[PDB]
Amino acid sequence: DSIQAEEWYFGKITRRESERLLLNAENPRGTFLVRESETVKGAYALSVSDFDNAKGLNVKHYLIRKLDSGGFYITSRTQFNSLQQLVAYYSKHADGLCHRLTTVCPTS
Numbered sequence: 677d678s679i680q681a682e683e684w685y686f687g688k689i690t691r692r693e694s695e696r697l698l699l700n701a702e703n704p705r706g707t708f709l710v711r712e713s714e715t716v717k718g719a720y721a722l723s724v725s726d727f728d729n730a731k732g733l734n735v736k737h738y739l740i741r742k743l744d745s746g747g748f749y750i751t752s753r754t755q756f757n758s759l760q761q762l763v764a765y766y767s768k769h770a771d772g773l774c775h776r777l778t779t780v781c782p783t784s
């Protein structure tokens with residue numbers, strides 16, 4: 677499946693629009709989507725809802741780097757062959773993120 681078939685992939689959605697979808701108070705902590713990065717050409721971003729001890733409802737953004745040789749990572753130590761594999765991995769455990777991925781971002 678191309679990434680575009682995944683319900684968590686929102687392509688060229690802006691960082692701002694992603695926060696609008698994610699900051700809904702109904703969303704469980706760890707609601708997420710994946711999108712193109714607005715600031716790094718070719719890269720992706722993983723946007724995750726959080727409840728911060730100081731800031732309350734908050735959206736965290738993680739940069740997903742792409743290798744021309746194939747593969748994706750947030751940290752170069754932990755590489756995946758696909759965005760689908762990266763999502764599956766972080767859905768199991770936070771492993772450094774603010775929270776594990778729990779919930780595919782609902783639409784409006």
Ligand SMILES: N[C@@H](Cc1ccc(OP(=O)(O)O)cc1)C(=O)O
Pocket residue numbers: 691712713714715716720721737738739
């Ligand atoms: N802003 C993040 C890192 C980051 C940078 C860029 C990025 O892509 P975009 O510019 O589309 O949000 C995502 C995440 C941080 O403070 O750790």
